[PDB]
Amino acid sequence: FTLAHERCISVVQKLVLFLLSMDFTCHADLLLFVCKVLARIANATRPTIHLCEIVNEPQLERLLLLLVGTDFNRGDISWGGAWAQYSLTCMLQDILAGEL
């Protein structure tokens, strides 16, 4: 069981690009699994993938706005519910912990 670094970057980039393009025609339960798979794949490779390799600057800004922005969150209403918020936070934390 060993994952090569070169092959997985494209998969992770496509997964995160899939995350940024969900709207009312997509459901949160799929997001809960996409986040988990992305984090596991990122941590699996021996030279673990860094967050700078995955996302772009506007992409990272949009990703953070999904959690803290006021056009996606409205007071007591969250982006994709508490489970989606929790999954996004856990994925970001796991990637950052893997890098350090």
Binding site: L51, V68, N73, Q93, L100
Partner: protein, 266 residues
Amino acid sequence: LIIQLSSVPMLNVCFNKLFSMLQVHHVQLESLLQLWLTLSLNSFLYNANRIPVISLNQASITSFLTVLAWYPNTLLRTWCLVLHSLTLMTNMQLNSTQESTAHLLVSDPNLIHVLVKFLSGTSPHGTNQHSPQVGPTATQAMQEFLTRLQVHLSSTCPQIFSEFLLKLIHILSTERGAFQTGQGPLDAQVKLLEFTLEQNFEVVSVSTISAVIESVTFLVHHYITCSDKVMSRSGSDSSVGARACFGGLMTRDQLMFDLLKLVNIL
């Protein structure tokens, strides 16, 4: 075998942008602070001796304090997040001859407003019943924040911190203040005073001292003069009243006693 960079520069840029977006209402303060804490303490408790991984700018801190000063109403959880955030920001470095972060925080007029708002105001007052206290956790957080401030400023210029403490006490104790009307959380105020009692006041000004003495004397005289005609206790209370002397052969009167001890030291 390739070389890969670090993610902290672009994280710094993104978080500085996010903190710059507060004033025009594009982000939510509580969520932003929670995410900041979670990502910064990833180097696993809110220990007050950890350097944040992500670091902010001077402008970010100024905007943060500015927003906090006028913020409409804050719940207890928001205040706890704010106190933890300030405690971590103290350990942060502004380098990447500027002053320290603690020096920047203390010499800012908005910190007085923030602390007065915390110590003189309650949660939103709905139809439910809540104690006029704050709990054992927020008090500990505030104490840790003050301790970190003092530790960082001691070697550089403790007179600034002492002036800051005296001015805060004077504003709290003045007419129409929290102490005069008995408004805020009592335990936090008692903790603040019992922390103040161990400070050093070597090179503080003389107008500040006189103002503090006048305010405290007026407040204590008013408290002693107008007391209620009816007294009622549990079967367990044993402390003597205010107007009782030579007894040696939590409570608001303890706050008054601590204020008098401060005057005696001054």
